[PDB]
Nucleic acid binder design. Structure first.
Lengths: 79, 92, 361, 102, 95, 79, 98, 93, 102
DNA sequence: CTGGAGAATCCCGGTGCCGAGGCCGCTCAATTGGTCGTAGACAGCTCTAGCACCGCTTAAACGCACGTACGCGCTGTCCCCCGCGTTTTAACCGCCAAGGGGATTACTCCCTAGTCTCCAGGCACGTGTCAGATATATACATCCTGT
DNA sequence: ACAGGATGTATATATCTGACACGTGCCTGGAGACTAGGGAGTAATCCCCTTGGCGGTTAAAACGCGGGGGACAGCGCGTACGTGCGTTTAAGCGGTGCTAGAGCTGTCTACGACCAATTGAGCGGCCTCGGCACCGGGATTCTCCAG
């Protein structure tokens, strides 16, 4: 499927940016699960904003407002 | 003066649900602060939502989407259904 | 006039002890079957919360070879839909549940399907009672429409299983004016019995052209056992030897006499329609009519038995037996129970009352 | 009243006054306080229902804030709603880790 | 041939200095369209919205891997494990 | 001074027993004492700020509720 | 002398204080602590007694939540005994120091 | 049709503090979102301050209290100092 | 004669007053409040652009990119505590390697 | 355990391209100036009520012996993951359409704001007694150590 | 392993007792009309920009293999902490007192709303040049087997 499209060395690059020196082999499937949960939450709120605006095009600012209400504020796309 | 609390409304809903059950004064303080908090969250996100679309009118649609943003999944679905039932009964 | 002799009624009580002397083998057979069946229902993931409510409830004490074993099931909180303003038939809707307990996964639409519950319950019983070794339990059949499921444990041990839902919620609104033990026992005993959970058993509304509805009528067996173990205005009634009453005596007399009449006149097709739960509710209304332990004394054994006979004949003549928990539910309606059967039972009880009861020997 | 006309228990007029008074927006639509008082009624109804079930579980007929604590924290979705919230006089759930037990 | 850990620390010095997106753009965009296809069918995305959600998702996973590294060092290890990630999310309160 | 020492050893031990903690090391007590000092400095700084805006001299329960409200640690039972 | 095992009294205290709901910190020393920190902020502030109760409710629930997460850290490190490195870890993960 | 950001104002402040240093377009967008975020925080905090004390008027005292709430220590001291300075200048002129 | 020049500021006092009016923050907006808030915003923008300018000077660049804003905010502890919830696009993170790993 | 080899990395220095700096022109939004109501400032006075204080009390903190059990340290064990190659996959970049939908203007008419006016629900203040907390004896549940 | 003598917790029993639940009277906030305007809906339209497709080019993912360093299990042991007993502490509680300050009420006034005219600062489009991106060769930084 596409969650495997989050590739194994991309998760390894994310961990190397995070400062992880050594990664177990089960980190990858769990990181795909966590990423899927996080995008389910952000896209749930973003699609809710977009359904509210009577639109079928999720803008950047809708994702910014979803991230604003969850508490992970994102700068640099509108506000 | 007088304070404006939801105490008798909590008590009416309690006798509607558990008809012979008591509720303490501290639990009434809990529910007053709770209904003020949930009203504050839903009215605030309806305000932010109507302001984001440059609409100057909070509608029932605004409140519905504020519930869908705020309240988690199946409880949000039941609450949207309850509000829709009440608005449709209000229109007739 | 004169009441029937209390010594003769105590001889009937001795005959009742002789009737229930045969517990120790049938109880062992049903305890083995209950153990195996309850420890194999739990293998199924769709019934991981089932249980046996602890009430061995001899509704039929005149013939202990037929059993009616009730099972409990701890359910989530339930929105109840009343059917057709019948005031006792409800629809089960699991109000809201995030845990997703498997009954809701089994459910159809929003109303819990009673026929599906009993169908797959009979299937699990069919799959598991043939696995019982050296205890031959086979699937018999019943008809009419009552939810009894007949199991015969290897020698005349006919068990009619009826699973009951157990909601720990608050009581429904039609149960409000019932449980009238306030001025009889206390309002406190009433309210503490209100705190106990209620129960749900199915029957489709058999009123003429109601067919296979997913309705649920309330059961009350555990509260009735608890008020039979604490029945006096004085709380040590039939516990210390100065307050021996005849409530348990007259109740066993009425239930044994009615079921022996139903045993005798089973060759007529009219006296299968009744049961002793009706007599038990009418007896609780007699307890409302006779509140004092001085008005339930051993010298009033024949008198209280006479008062129970006259009130059951009142329920036959005035056509009104309210449930003790629902005041808005007459159990003696003319369409669930035929009226010619009521006339036939009235004729037999009037015949037996006025001729010094030649059934007592 | 608008509460009776909508079949609700919470005061639709008071919620409309609070929507106008709180400066949430300039105009407040007519179905908005109906819908909002309905949602408040549903949340209060569900929490009082769970609290009364918890009160029956300890056979107490008077709901104290412990029962509200148990009700909110045993429903995971209400717990998701009130994760920030401290209930006063609440305590916590009876929750012991399984490595601690003998 | 390097010692097993020298080029890992060199990767850490590399990717902490770099700023660009670490997930490949188009697999992530396909993932976002799939998860949105679950909620509302036939949705269109501004490319800036997918870039914004990708920036936020990478920042969230870098925060999670920082706290996961804290957990794994706390157990006197250098290897992160799913026990560490479940611990981090259970402490933050995200489940 | 020394009122922070007023948070006793068995008080922190009782808080740990409510928290599901089985055993307690000997240095937990001063660390918990410092953490409680930090939490109270934050909440009382916000609450005293609310009070000083009201031109009053008495910190009230609603002020502490709003201090904890903006902290995120939202309290019920005093409003 | 009927001395229990060293885990038994801890488990009955855990069940007892999770069953209870009253204030575990003694009210008057906590009140002195609050008055000390406010005396550092603004001199001679009277306190509403319900505000002292509200501070104590927030402090007891915050430390109980902190000891839950700290116990998760201590169970995580193959231990059973919490240590201040567990608390420093839990607060660094929650984001109070970072 | 007019996206009113703080772009030229951030550019004036940057040419005040570093007159030989430029700024990228994305950094200008980030500073626009930053100024809008801090404005929404201080304005919402002053909104709730007005409704707690039942004032219907945000004044400079509400903004001073909202600044003392939202900002950390020396940021609060210097920001309250800058605000008091600017209100004093605006009053004197 | 603009009010920004009257107050000796850079940020638009009139625009801050317009945004405090139409944002439904209160029924009335006192006239000292947009001056005070424009001063606070000018000071916060000045502090972040000051540290970002130092970050650009340290990497020998004469143009602030979002990496410089990330380094500026996350190195200063007070601005970090201000923006602990905020992820900056194109920011990256600080170079933060654990010494026990080294 | 110190030196050499090389793979990687930071500046050197030329090229060049394209986004910031910068004017130019239009125009909505800010600034200025009266008028108005009215929220807020100020004062005063009630009156709760928080602060100080005693003093008896009794659970509870505090200290101290102490045995045991958990932490940490160490050691091997072994596999699991890093690293380098060699393959395959597809992301990426550029091109190049086709139309859905965003954005905007343009008319409109319902819907809410606002004012009025009457009521009736909601709140303050009584009060009766009921759930609960008290003790108090009793029984059911759980350990901890000897056979 | 199971019984046995504690040891604690839970269930039932009078007795309080202060707090929920409910009546009674008020009074202001909701409701019912009535109007005016203005937002929001709806129609209809320009054109951006998303979707899709395709070719080519290669950086990157993927798999494989060698091995090595760490996770994990286990032994050990030393001390740190729990449990418990006895010992001081001071929390608590009731109780009375003092006045400080919340809270309210009336009484003005400066302040913002509001409108209205008057004009610039701010933005949209518009070129255009230095800073950043490369792209190869010097110079360094830095890890890694051995006499």
């Amino acid at each position: 499927d596409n969650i495997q499209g989050i590739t194994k060395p991309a998760i390894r690059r994310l961990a190397r940016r995070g400062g992880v020196k050594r990664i177990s082999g089960l980190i990858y499937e769990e990181t795909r699960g966590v990423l899927k949960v996080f995008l389910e939450n952000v896209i749930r709120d973003a699609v809710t904003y977009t359904e509210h605006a009577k639109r079928k095009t999720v803008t950047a600012m809708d994702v910014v407002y979803a991230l604003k209400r969850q508490g992970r504020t994102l700068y640099g796309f509108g506000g | 003066s007088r304070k404006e609390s939801y105490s008798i409304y909590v008590y009416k809903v309690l006798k509607q649900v558990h008809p012979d059950t008591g509720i303490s004064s501290k639990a009434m303080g809990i529910m007053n602060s709770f209904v003020n908090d949930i009203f504050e969250r839903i009215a605030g996100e309806a305000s932010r939502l109507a302001h984001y679309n440059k609409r100057s009118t909070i509608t029932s649609r605004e409140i519905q989407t504020a519930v869908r943003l705020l309240l988690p999944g199946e409880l949000a679905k039941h609450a949207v259904s309850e509000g829709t039932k009440a608005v449709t009964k209000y229109t007739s | 006039d004169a009441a029937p002799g209390a010594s003769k009624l105590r001889a009937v009580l001795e005959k009742l002890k002789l009737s229930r002397d045969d517990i120790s083998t049938a109880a062992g057979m049903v305890k083995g079957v209950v153990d195996h069946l309850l420890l194999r229902l739990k293998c199924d993931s769709a019934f991981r919360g089932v249980g046996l409510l602890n009430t061995y409830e001899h509704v039929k004490i005149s013939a202990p070879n037929e059993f009616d074993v009730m099972f409990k099931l701890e359910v989530p909180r339930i929105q109840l839909e009343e059917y057709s303003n019948t005031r006792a038939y409800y629809f089960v809707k699991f109000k809201r549940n995030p845990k997703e307990n498997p009954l809701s996964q089994f459910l159809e639409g929003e109303i819990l399907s009673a026929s599906k519950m009993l169908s797959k319950f009979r299937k699990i019983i069919k799959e598991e009672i043939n696995d019982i070794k050296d205890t031959d339990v086979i699937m018999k059949r019943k008809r009419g429409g009552s939810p009894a499921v007949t199991l015969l444990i290897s020698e005349k041990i006919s068990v009619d299983i009826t699973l009951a839902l157990e909601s720990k919620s608050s009581w429904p609104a039609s149960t409000q004016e019932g449980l009238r033990i306030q001025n009889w026992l206390s309002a406190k005993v009433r309210k503490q019995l209100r705190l106990k959970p209620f129960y749900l058993v199915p029957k489709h509304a058999k009123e003429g052209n109601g067919f296979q509805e997913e309705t649920w009528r309330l059961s009350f067996s555990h509260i009735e056992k608890e008020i039979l173990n604490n029945h006096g205005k004085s709380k040590t009634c039939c516990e210390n030897k100065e307050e021996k009453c005849c409530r348990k005596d007259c109740l066993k007399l009425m239930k044994y006499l009615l079921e022996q009449l139903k045993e005798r006149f089973k060759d007529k097709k009219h006296l299968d329609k009744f049961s002793s739960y009706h007599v038990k509710t009418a007896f609780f209304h007699v307890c409302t009519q006779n509140p004092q332990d001085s008005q339930w004394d051993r010298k009033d054994l024949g008198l209280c038995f006479d008062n129970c006979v006259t009130y059951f004949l009142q329920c036959l003549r005035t056509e009104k037996l309210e449930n003790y928990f629902i005041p808005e539910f007459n159990l003696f309606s003319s369409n669930l129970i035929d009226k010619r059967s009521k006339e036939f039972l009235t004729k037999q009880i009037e015949y037996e009352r006025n001729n010094e009861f030649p059934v007592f020997d | 009243t608008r509460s009776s006309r909508a079949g609700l228990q919470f005061p639709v007029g008071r919620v409309h006054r609070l929507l106008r008074k709180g400066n949430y927006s300039e105009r407040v639509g007519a179905g908005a306080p109906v819908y909002l008082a309905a949602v408040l009624e549903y949340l209060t109804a569900e929490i009082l229902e769970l609290a009364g079930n918890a009160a029956r579980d300890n056979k107490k007929t008077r709901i104290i804030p412990r029962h509200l604590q148990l009700a909110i924290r045993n429903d995971e979705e209400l717990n998701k709603l009130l994760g920030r919230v401290t209930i006063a006089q609440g305590g916590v759930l009876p929750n012991i880790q399984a490595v601690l037990l003998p | 041939r390097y010692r097993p850990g020298t080029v890992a620390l060199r990767e850490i010095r590399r990717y902490q200095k770099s700023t660009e997106l670490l997930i490949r753009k188009l697999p992530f965009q396909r993932l976002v369209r799939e998860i949105a296809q679950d909620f509302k069918t036939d949705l269109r995305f501004q490319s800036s919205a997918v870039m914004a959600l990708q920036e936020a998702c990478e920042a969230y996973l870098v925060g999670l891997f920082e706290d996961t590294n804290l957990c794994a060092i706390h157990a006197k290890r250098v290897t992160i494990m799913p026990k560490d990630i479940q611990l981090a999310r259970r402490i933050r309160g995200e489940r």
